[PDB]
Amino acid sequence: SYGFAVASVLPTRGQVVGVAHPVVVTFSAPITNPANRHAAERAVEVKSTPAMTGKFEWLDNDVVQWVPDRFWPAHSTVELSVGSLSSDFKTGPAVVGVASISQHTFTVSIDGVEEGPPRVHFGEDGVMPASMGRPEYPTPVGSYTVLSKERSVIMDSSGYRLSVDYAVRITSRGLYVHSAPWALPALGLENVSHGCISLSREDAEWYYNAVDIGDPVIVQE
Numbered sequence: 001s002y003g004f005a006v007a008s009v010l011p012t013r014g015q016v017v018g019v020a021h022p023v024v025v026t027f028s029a030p031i032t033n034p035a036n037r038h039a040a041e042r043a044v045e046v047k048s049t050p051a052m053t054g055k056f057e058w059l060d061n062d063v064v065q066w067v068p069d070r071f072w073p074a075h076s077t078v079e080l081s082v083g084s085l086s087s088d089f090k091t092g093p094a095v096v097g098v099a100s101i102s103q104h105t106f107t108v109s110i111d112g113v114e115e116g117p118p119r120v121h122f123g124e125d126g127v128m129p130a131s132m133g134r135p136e137y138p139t140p141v142g143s144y145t146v147l148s149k150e151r152s153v154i155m156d157s158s159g160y161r162l163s164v165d166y167a168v169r170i171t172s173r174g175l176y177v178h179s180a181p182w183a184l185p186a187l188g189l190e191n192v193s194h195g196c197i198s199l200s201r202e203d204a205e206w207y208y209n210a211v212d213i214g215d216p217v218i219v220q221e
């Protein structure tokens with residue numbers, strides 16, 4: 001009996017990840033029976049050092065992720081067991097971005113210290129003017145993690161088609177923190193994007209270069 005055989009786990013052994021990186025478990029074969037998912041979850045029980053609580057979310061019939069309830073400690077070696085499989089990974093700095101819909105800001109902290117690169121400009125370090133989604137295409141509130149980072153990626157409406165310089169992806173569907181030079185007059189003032197968190201090129205560059213996959217991004221009203 002091997003229906004719950006695990007092919008692979010992320011983070012990989014020794015990987016350097018951001019402080020909210022999920023534990024992603026990929027099964028050798030699809031678990032198509034939703035009733036068998038609880039048994040699979042138990043087969044892949046996640047035990048970390050330091051201990052951490054978390055919740056499973058099925059991404060596909062052969063992929064379950066365990067989302068930690070809290071941030072991993074920064075600059076650390078985290079020991080990880082998934083079922084009997086013993087591994088470890090490392091965390092870099094805690095690079096946390098908080099988007100405020102009402103304030104029109106994106107606030108970046110590194111290990112707790114608000115910081116930004118050395119038009120509206122706030123003069124509180126780490127507080128970047130931003131522009132979130134318009135009423136018809138709002139930025140949804142919640143807790144996200146950086147899924148990928150790319151340069152000069154094409155984003156289209158699927159009306160628009162944009163070549164976007166610094167793109168930090170936070171949902172599978174296509175929500176990003178990114179550089180939005182065409183949108184400068186709105187930053188710190190109005191929410192005129194299509195759901196993405198728009199920054200100036202310079203702010204986006206600094207944030208992109210600072211953040212890692214797995215770091216948290218919080219959207220709040």
Ligand SMILES: [Ca+2]
Nearest residue numbers: 016017212213
């Ligand atoms: Ca990384």
